[PDB]
Design a binder for this molecule. Structure first.
Ligand SMILES: CCCCCCCCCCCCCCCCCC(=O)OC[C@H](COP(=O)([O-])OCC(O)COP(=O)([O-])OC[C@@H](COC(=O)CCCCCCCCCCCCCCCCC)OC(=O)CCCCCCCCCCCCCCCCC)OC(=O)CCCCCCCCCCCCCCCCC
Ligand SMILES: CCCCCCCCCCCCCCCCCC(=O)OC[C@H](COP(=O)([O-])OCC(O)COP(=O)([O-])OC[C@@H](COC(=O)CCCCCCCCCCCCCCCCC)OC(=O)CCCCCCCCCCCCCCCCC)OC(=O)CCCCCCCCCCCCCCCCC
Ligand SMILES: CCCCCCCCCCCCCCCCCC(=O)OC[C@H](COP(=O)([O-])OCC[N+](C)(C)C)OC(=O)CCCCCCCCCCCCCCCCC
Ligand SMILES: CCCCCCCCCCCCCCCCCC(=O)OC[C@H](COP(=O)([O-])OCC[N+](C)(C)C)OC(=O)CCCCCCCCCCCCCCCCC
Ligand SMILES: CCCCCCCCCCCCCCCCCC(=O)OC[C@H](COP(=O)(O)OCCN)OC(=O)CCCCCCCCCCCCCCCCC
Ligand SMILES: Nc1ncnc2c1ncn2[C@@H]1O[C@H](COP(=O)(O)OP(=O)(O)O)[C@@H](O)[C@H]1O
Lengths: 68, 125, 587, 6, 115, 98, 228, 26, 39, 118, 50, 167
């Protein structure tokens, strides 16, 4: 009768079950996926890159001839 | 609760007593009062460090508060003269000291808060 | 028009600004909130327009003015001093920055303190402080300089301790008051020594005859001290107290309970720059001083390292900005120790503009969070303050000195001209390197924790700011005027910094004379750099890259994306290697 | 702040 | 003759004062090439953006060539760039040739750059 | 505009928050707890022991109560609460309650 | 109450925010990939369909059940534990050493600069982040009953797989309280994937055994009498 | 929402001086 | 003979050293030309 | 039923709901973003990105110092095709010698001109 | 390096407090104020010397 | 908490619960022949691209059957390579809102087509993978009202409200 790979899994399961749901119930609004996102998904770089392309094309056809 | 921890010439022992218990003199409190006040202070500190923190982990916070609740439930049923209860008091006072922040967030509703008493209110006289 | 070039209107517009401020202070019952706002806005806009017109003439062309208002006071038997103003490159460099930041802070200050009972008092105090600083930098003699020095200390004592009903803020104001009294003592003793030596108080004359007294000594009770050494010692002491160098910095973090427009003015240019101005005002004296040569780089580097590392650990937004300001003041001291006076001006302008903009964004965030300035109780603010998020991103990437930004160049220029002949050079260089890399840490911490973390704040903020009845075209968590102020401030900052970069860093040198005859070979490594120097700067570049990787890919918490985060890091490393191979060798 | 009589 | 302008004219001290050449340029050997460039820019005013974005310097392209030559020579002689770069590449060959025994004696390349 | 005449302070009902709203939110939060058996027996006159709230669960609930009401309560004030009514009145009479 | 005013914002005006805000789809724009591939017949042709249907993945590599029986490492052995995704990621990260390191050695102008930068980077952040956890990671665990041992398959340098045998009687559980202090950096930045409450060790040799949190456990193997 | 009363005078609590002010703490 | 004088002396010595390096490089290029012209 | 549409939608709405609010007030998310603030922020962010792109395209010395020197896209005049044959070959040789002599002259003049302007 | 005392809260609060420089400087200033000003100036000077 | 594997079998009388109207065919060739099926398949290409390149573990379901004795759901999944058959234990299925499915992937997703069911997305905790259906579909009313599919036996507050949390 050893204590390998099943005894301690059962103990961990019991420890997890012994947690109180009350705190969970008062913090569910914090993890709302409707109200939070990551930085790269909010700072979209498509239209700024279009403006960048337009500006660089204007530079190339205005002052780009005189390089070096 | 008045947050005058640092604006009075207090020693660390007085500040530690005020942080762990709502008074400078915890010897005038009942056993239940002391246990409940220490539990409230510990939960407040753990929330201030593991929910409103830097890189907060909710799972770890739940584990720690469950363990603290078990320990304090054991603490409540003990006797005041027992040495095990004294060891528990020492352990959780050490926990309060170890998480002490010189830059505590003070709620704006407390008497000695950062934005308290900003306006002079005129009475009927 | 030639009449404008021959007779400046800066004096007229500045007098209009000053008199409107004073009369609004005295006749505040006739002018309501709107009256004070409108009158002072008109005066400040006229002043800004006139100074903007003259900025180009003074900076590019060799225009400067010496104005005398009249004989003022008798200071010796048969001696009288006059009220003199010197509008030259050194003065205009500080005054234009102060006036522009002040104009935009003035427009922002009405949206801030939106329904407070004492908006007029704050507006007038900010105007008084700006006027005092502009008078200080435009000094023509030492007496006007002392008057401005005492005025900036007094008016900053009232912006601090604005909440005069609290003794807690009174203590914080009194700390700065005591430090300012020490500064005044040091400055006035230095002026007394100068007057006892040369018997004049005119700055220009002082800058041209002080070299004749290099081999002079003064007799203290048991000591024979070189004159230049003692004068430079006192000037450097007062400058150190005002610029909040290490040790004498403790008054500055305690100055943060002032309203955020006052912090934006005080910490970006104005007060913290005052000491730097002194170093720029009396350059020959410190060129001929051994004490300056030893003390400027060492103290500057120590201050830079200390402020940079302390800033990266702060949780209060205002404390983070204050410690960043301390670090940048140290960097400015080192840049002056370089011996190139253009780099000092470039650093001053860049730091002042971007620090002021960051203060404005932080102030809006703090107002939203209901006077809680610690971002441990913030998070997920991007959807409630989107303009603040994006403008703050721009301002922090410029302020932190990240690669491919305007703030990168001032750091690079500082490291170009650093002198390696100091005895304590290892400590100085290590401190400078450690302080240079600290910007990324606090910039990332501030931005990510305020805007793109988990919701750590109170439920009331988020839930009250998101009710269905509030959905409208008028919905906003800030004011339109604040957004316009920040946008125009950023645009003007970019334009001015680009103009200055063209004037100083182009192949064709266009800047006006700086009235200094000490010339070194620092521009050579800017004009014709060699291989080892480029490798040395690449070392710091790669250190910054490693730190960025650390702040992006480190997992300090359990998450559902941990394994995918490691996978993405591996993918990025492999892709970078292959991209480098393709871009360098084949096609 | 909420307005109060003066 | 890298320090000489198109027509070999040496400007007088009064001319230097009148054309308000900065002290930074005055301390160098490129005043005689800087003054005509400043004059051409004076009768050909240009905005700072165009000055930044024009490699040829526009209408000032003739004088700017002389100024570039003078500035290159001035800065490279000021910081010994030619000797330093000659010693950086094939330091053994430079040591054998004895290009500059004053610099060669104390020269040490960093360990990270191929030992 | 102020009427330019002497106007005294108005105390109105003495509540800075809606007492019914405060009571409903507090009772919902109490019912969220694990050891509370039924939400339908909770009343303003109910004592914490009646609804099965031992002192440790009491401090647990009162911490989340101060989190939910945007205030913070002193130890003595919480010790003086005997029923739900006492806490409801104390919270509704607080100037900082949101 | 936006519907009560003639001039007011609408969802048509809010549609531009769908790039930064997640909402259910409303309509298809002309430039979307779905519309482009639905309209262009170059994608409807047989060549494109054949190219797509036989590239970029395969169905035989997709798990078709919630129960998996991996091939036996040895005859007479039975399966206990397997890892799913962290093992693959760790093996790819280790395999990076097989290509990036020789690539730097052959194509970098200054290879010593790369090593001089990699030494402190490894010793200060990367050793605790990935490498040590990968060394103590358990990729596969099986049991040999005739030998009464466990076979543990692990990942080495360059993505090398290797299997070692450990005696069952030498296995012992390591409570987290015994390791949280002298390895706090590893458990702070490089241990969030493995289970810190199920750490085992071989007392004979001192080797550790970490298991992936989102791994798979065999019900029959876990209840075997040899493992008790 | 709710008709809040005027700002309470408890916003500025009165100090009571429970202890003597020492001349050594002037 | 104290104070900033040591810094001034160091600056003068450094300027002399840089001029000497430039002169040595010029002499080297002259020697290379006269050596190659001989062949 | 787990697959019932009514219950599934109810759970979708209720997963992150606020349980201390009324029946119709349980939502805890912002359903929109401020139009004016977002537009102004997008404009200023676009300005910053355009500035970064100008810095990358016009002043690439950071990339030269950090990652080294990359290959350059081809750029040749192809103007010498006008002449053909032996003329073309001879002129190629002349231009090649001219380029090599120009580089040598640059190096040698750089080394000589130290004595000038002293 | 598998253990790091610099990621613990003690070092973190040490750095966040500005290396305790303000606390150290204020303690010495209090000693100066109390001793010099109160004791020496008012008590010594006025009561004994005056 | 721990992914213990339960060996299961297949029942001989499956109960059909979900039917896709536009994918009644049984192969890529049949889908290609049908015009509506071909159009839907081409519209689903960004879905497969997000599956492959962006590592978003979603799956697209055509048919669903219930095995009550073993409590196992049989799912017919449509990928770009072809049609797959999968078995899911009933204990490993939870409902998720649409925003969970979108936010699970860090990369921004392509604009989704209007035919995928945006209200009936189900997460597999053991496989950690999403399951989506068609808006134009046939749901068996008697099949889904089976007693073993009632939420009275399958509801679990922890597994449904806290098992999957997108930080
Ligand atoms: C031309 C014009 C260009 C204009 C560019 C404008 C900015 C573009 C980026 C917008 C988003 C910025 C977020 C900033 C905040 C942040 O990092 O939050 C942590 C935030 C943590 O949130 P999370 O998503 O939960 O993170 C968990 C995983 O790490 C999530 O992992 P993952 O799988 O999501 O990420 C993988 C992949 C995802 O791919 C993308 O997101 C693609 C889109 C962005 C590409 C950006 C360029 C990448 C190549 C360089 O990203 C990478 O592989 C990034 C590797 C490259 C960055 C690190 C090394 C840089 C060395 C050289 C720097 C030179 C420039 C310096 C700065 C210049 C001025 C801004 O991490 C990210 O946002 C990572 C993605 C963005 C990386 C690029 C950032 C570029 C800016 C410089 C670095 C940041 C410095 C500190 C700034 C602080 C504010 C002032
Ligand atoms: C085949 C290989 C494909 C490999 C695809 C990338 C890897 C995917 C798996 C890993 C995931 C990941 O990390 O993704 C990165 C990244 C993740 O970003 P995300 O925010 O998650 O976006 C997710 C969706 O794409 C939804 O994003 P979206 O719909 O908003 O599309 C915007 C997206 C793509 O849209 C654009 O880039 C629009 C550009 C407009 C202006 C174009 C002209 C600019 C001036 C130059 C003119 C010459 O741009 C961005 O996301 C901007 C962030 C940085 C990426 C672009 C960097 C540009 C250079 C910056 C430094 C300078 O994925 C992408 O950016 C999408 C890649 C799409 C295919 C890229 C290859 C084709 C690009 C077209 C031009 C070249 C054509 C070559 C034809 C064939 C020649 C042989
Ligand atoms: C003698 C030992 C040789 C083997 C050394 C093994 C350790 C280093 C192995 C390489 C790791 C990095 C591979 C990808 C490099 C991509 C960039 C590149 O090619 O730059 C060219 C340059 C090489 O170009 P170079 O050598 O021709 O010259 C560049 C100029 N100097 C050296 C003066 C800067 O790459 C490096 O400098 C890489 C070395 C420094 C970084 C070492 C790894 C740190 C940890 C990983 C960080 C992330 C790396 C990937 C992303 C980098 C860009 C954001
Ligand atoms: C938004 C606009 C772009 C903002 C970012 C600009 C970043 C680069 C700033 C360069 C400042 C120094 C400068 O003018 O260098 C001279 C150079 C021109 O080259 P140059 O030949 O005159 O001088 C270079 C001198 N060396 C080689 C010694 C470094 O200016 C630029 O490259 C301008 C780049 C930005 C142009 C913006 C136009 C509006
Ligand atoms: C009081 C102390 C008086 C000391 C003796 C007089 C001053 C020094 C005279 C000799 C000249 C000299 O060394 O000047 C340089 C010195 C600044 O250099 P220093 O700080 O000594 O550099 C460290 C070197 N490793 O210069 C000084 O130290 C000048 C200090 C002047 C101000 C002294 C304090 C105010 C007056 C009393
Ligand atoms: N005059 C004084 N002399 C010395 N110490 C004082 C004096 N006044 C206050 N203190 C210190 O400051 C603290 C003030 O606390 P106090 O405001 O009296 O709290 P409470 O009102 O709850 O009694 C006391 O604990 C005391 O130690």
């Amino acid at each position: 009768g050893r204590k390998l790979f099943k005894h301690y899994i059962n103990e961990n399961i019991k420890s997890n079950n012994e947690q109180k749901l009350f705190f969970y119930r008062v913090n569910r609004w914090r993890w709302n996926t409707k109200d939070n996102t990551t930085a790269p998904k909010f700072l979209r770089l498509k239209y700024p890159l279009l403006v960048t392309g337009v500006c660089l094309f204007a530079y190339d056809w205005t002052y780009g001839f005189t390089q070096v | 609760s008045k947050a005058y921890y640092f604006v009075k010439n207090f020693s660390w022992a007085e500040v530690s007593n005020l942080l762990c218990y709502g008074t400078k003199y915890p010897t005038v409190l009942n056993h239940q009062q002391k246990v409940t006040r220490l539990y409230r202070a510990t939960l407040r500190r753990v929330y201030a460090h593991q929910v409103e923190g830097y890189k907060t982990d909710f799972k770890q916070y739940n584990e720690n508060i469950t363990d603290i609740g078990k320990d304090f439930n054991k603490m409540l049923a003990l006797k005041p003269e027992s040495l095990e209860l004294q060891a528990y008091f020492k352990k959780y006072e050490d926990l309060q000291e170890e998480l002490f922040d010189p830059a505590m967030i003070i709620d704006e509703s407390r008497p000695y808060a950062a934005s308290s008493g900003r306006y002079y209110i005129f009475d009927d006289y | 028009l030639d009449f404008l070039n021959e007779y400046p209107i800066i004096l007229l517009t500045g007098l209009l600004f000053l008199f409107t401020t004073i009369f609004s202070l005295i006749c505040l019952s006739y002018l309501g909130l709107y009256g004070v706002f409108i009158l002072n806005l008109a005066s400040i806009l006229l002043f800004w327009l006139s100074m903007l017109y003259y900025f180009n003439l003074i900076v590019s062309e060799n225009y400067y003015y010496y104005i005398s208002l009249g004989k003022w006071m008798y200071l010796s038997n048969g001696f009288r001093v006059s009220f003199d103003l010197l509008i030259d490159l050194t003065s205009i460099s500080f005054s234009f920055l102060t006036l522009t930041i002040g104009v935009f802070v003035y427009i922002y200050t009405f949206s801030y303190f939106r329904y407070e009972p004492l908006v007029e008092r704050l507006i007038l105090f900010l105007n008084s402080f700006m006027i005092s600083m502009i008078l200080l930098v435009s000094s023509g003699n030492f007496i006007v300089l002392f008057l401005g020095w005492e005025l900036i200390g007094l008016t900053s004592f009232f912006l601090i301790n604005f909440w005069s009903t609290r003794v807690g803020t009174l203590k914080a104001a009194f700390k700065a008051f005591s430090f300012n009294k020490l500064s005044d003592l040091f400055l006035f003793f230095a002026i007394l020594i100068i007057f006892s030596t040369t018997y004049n108080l005119d700055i220009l004359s002082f800058n041209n005859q002080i070299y004749l007294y290099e081999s002079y000594n003064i007799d203290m009770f048991y000591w024979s001290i070189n004159l230049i050494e003692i004068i430079s010692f006192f000037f450097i002491s007062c400058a150190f107290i005002k610029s909040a160098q290490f040790g004498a910095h403790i008054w500055l973090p305690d100055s943060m309970e002032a309203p955020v427009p006052a912090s934006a003015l005080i910490h970006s240019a104005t007060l913290v720059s005052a000491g730097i101005y002194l170093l720029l005002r009396l350059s020959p004296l410190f060129e001929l001083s051994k004490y300056a040569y030893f003390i400027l780089p060492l103290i500057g580097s120590v201050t830079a390292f200390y402020g940079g590392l302390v800033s990266a650990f702060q949780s209060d937004t205002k404390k983070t900005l204050a410690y960043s300001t301390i670090s940048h003041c140290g960097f400015l001291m080192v840049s002056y120790s370089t011996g190139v006076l253009e780099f000092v001006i470039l650093y001053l302008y860049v730091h002042g503009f971007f620090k002021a903009a960051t203060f404005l964004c932080v102030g809006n965030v703090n107002r939203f969070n209901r006077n809680i300035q610690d971002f441990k109780r913030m998070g997920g603010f991007y959807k409630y303050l989107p303009f603040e998020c994006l403008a703050s991103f721009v301002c922090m990437i410029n302020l932190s000195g990240l690669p491919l930004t305007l703030g990168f160049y001032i750091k690079h220029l500082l490291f170009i001209g650093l002198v390696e002949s100091y005895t304590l050079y290892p400590l100085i260089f290590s401190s400078l390197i450690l302080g240079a890399i600290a910007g990324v840490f606090y910039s990332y911490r501030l931005f990510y924790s305020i805007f793109f973390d988990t919701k750590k704040g109170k439920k009331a903020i988020y839930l009250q700011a998101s009710r269905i009845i509030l959905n409208s075209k008028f919905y906003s968590n800030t004011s339109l005027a604040s957004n316009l102020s920040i946008t125009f401030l950023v645009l003007i900052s970019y334009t001015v910094i680009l103009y200055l970069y063209c004037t100083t860093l182009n192949n064709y040198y266009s800047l006006s004379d700086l009235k200094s005859i000490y010339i070194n070979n620092a521009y050579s490594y800017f004009y014709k750099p060699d291989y080892n120097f480029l490798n040395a700067v690449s070392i710091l570049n790669w250190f910054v890259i490693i730190l960025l990787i650390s702040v992006i890919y480190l997992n300090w918490r359990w998450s559902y994306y941990y394994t995918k985060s490691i996978d993405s890091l591996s993918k990025f490393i492999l892709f970078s290697f292959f991209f480098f191979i393709f871009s360098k060798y084949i096609l | 702040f909420q307005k109060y009589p003066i | 003759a890298w320090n000489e302008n198109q027509q070999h004219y040496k400007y007088s001290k009064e001319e230097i004062e009148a054309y308000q050449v900065p002290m930074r340029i005055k301390a160098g050997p490129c005043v005689d090439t800087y003054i005509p460039l400043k004059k051409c820019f004076q009768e050909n005013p240009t905005s700072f953006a165009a000055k930044m974005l024009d490699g040829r310097k526009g209408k000032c392209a003739k004088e700017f060539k002389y100024y570039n030559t003078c500035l290159n020579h001035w800065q490279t002689y000021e910081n010994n760039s030619h000797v330093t770069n000659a010693y950086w590449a094939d330091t053994s060959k430079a040591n054998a040739d004895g290009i500059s025994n004053t610099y060669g004696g104390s020269f040490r390349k960093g360990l990270a750059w191929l030992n | 505009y102020a009427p330019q005449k002497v106007v005294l302070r108005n105390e109105k009902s003495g509540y800075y928050a809606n007492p019914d709203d405060v009571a409903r939110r507090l009772i919902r939060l109490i019912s969220l707890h694990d050891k509370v058996q039924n939400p339908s027996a909770i009343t303003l006159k109910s004592t914490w022991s009646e609804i099965g709230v031992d002192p440790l669960s009491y401090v647990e609930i009162m911490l989340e109560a101060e989190n939910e009401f945007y205030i913070e309560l002193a130890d003595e004030d919480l010790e003086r609460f005997r029923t739900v009514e006492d806490a409801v009145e104390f919270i509704a009479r607080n100037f900082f309650t949101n | 109450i936006r519907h009560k005013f003639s001039n007011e914002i609408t969802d048509d005006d809010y549609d531009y925010q769908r790039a930064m805000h997640v909402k259910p789809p409303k309509e298809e724009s002309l430039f979307q990939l779905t519309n482009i591939l639905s309209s262009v017949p170059v994608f409807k042709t047989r060549f494109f369909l054949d190219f797509i249907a036989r590239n970029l993945d395969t169905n035989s590599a997709v798990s078709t059940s919630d129960f998996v029986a991996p091939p036996r490492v040895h005859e007479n052995s039975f399966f206990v534990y397997h890892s799913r995704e962290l093992g693959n990621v760790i093996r790819k990260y280790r395999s990076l050493e097989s290509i990036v390191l020789p690539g730097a050695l052959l194509t970098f102008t200054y290879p010593l600069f790369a090593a001089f930068v990699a030494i402190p980077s490894y010793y200060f952040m990367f050793n605790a982040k990935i490498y040590e956890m990968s060394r103590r990671f358990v990729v596969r665990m099986d049991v040999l009953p005739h030998l009464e041992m466990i076979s543990v398959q692990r990942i080495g340098a360059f993505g090398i797989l290797y299997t070692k045998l450990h005696r069952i009687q030498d296995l012992e559980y390591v409570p987290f309280d015994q390791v949280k202090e002298q390895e706090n950096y590893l458990w702070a930045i490089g241990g969030h994937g493995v289970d810190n409450q199920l750490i085992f060790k071989d007392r004979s040799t001192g080797e550790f055994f970490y298991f992936e949190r989102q791994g798979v456990w065999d019900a029959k193997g876990l209840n075997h009498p040899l493992l008790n | 929402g709710w008709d809040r009363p005027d700002v309470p005078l408890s916003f500025n609590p009165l100090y009571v001086h429970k202890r003597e002010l020492s001349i050594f703490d002037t | 003979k104290n104070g900033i004088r040591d810094v001034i002396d160091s600056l003068n010595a450094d300027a002399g050293k840089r001029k000497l390096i430039n002169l040595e490089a010029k002499n080297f290029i002259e020697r290379v030309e006269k050596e190659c012209e001989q062949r | 039923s787990i697959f019932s549409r009514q219950f599934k939608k109810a759970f979708n709405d209720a997963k992150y709901q606020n349980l201390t609010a009324a029946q119709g007030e349980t939502y805890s998310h912002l359903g929109w973003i401020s139009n004016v603030d977002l537009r102004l922020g997008r404009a200023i962010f676009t300005f910053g990105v355009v500035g970064i792109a100008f810095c990358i395209y016009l002043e690439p010395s950071y990339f030269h110092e950090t990652f080294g020197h990359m290959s350059q896209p081809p750029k040749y005049d192809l103007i010498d095709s006008n002449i053909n044959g032996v003329e073309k070959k001879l002129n190629k040789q002349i231009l090649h010698r001219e380029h090599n002599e120009h580089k040598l002259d640059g190096f040698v003049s750089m080394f000589k001109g130290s004595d000038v302007a002293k | 390096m598998l253990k790091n005392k610099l990621i613990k809260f003690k070092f973190f609060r040490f750095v966040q407090s500005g290396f305790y420089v303000d606390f150290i400087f204020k303690k010495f200033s209090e000693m100066f104020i109390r001793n010099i000003f109160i004791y020496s100036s008012i008590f010594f000077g006025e009561k004994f010397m005056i | 908490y721990y992914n213990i594997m339960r060996q299961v079998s297949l029942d001989s009388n499956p109960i059909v619960l979900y039917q896709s109207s536009t994918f009644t065919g049984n192969g890529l060739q049949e889908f290609y022949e049908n015009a509506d099926a071909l159009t839907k398949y081409l519209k689903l290409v960004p879905f497969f691209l997000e599956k492959n390149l962006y590592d978003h573990p979603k799956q697209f379901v055509i048919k669903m059957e219930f095995h009550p004795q073993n409590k196992v759901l049989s799912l017919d999944c449509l990928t770009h390579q072809g049609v797959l058959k999968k078995t899911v234990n009933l204990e490993n299925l939870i409902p998720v809102p649409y925003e969970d499915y979108v936010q699970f992937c860090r990369r921004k997703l392509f604009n989704a087509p209007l035919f995928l069911d945006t209200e009936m997305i189900y997460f597999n905790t053991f496989q950690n993978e999403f399951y989506v259906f068609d808006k134009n579909a046939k749901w068996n009313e008697e099949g889904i009202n089976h007693p073993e599919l009632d939420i009275s036996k399958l509801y679990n507050e922890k597994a449904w409200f806290d098992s999957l949390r997108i930080i």
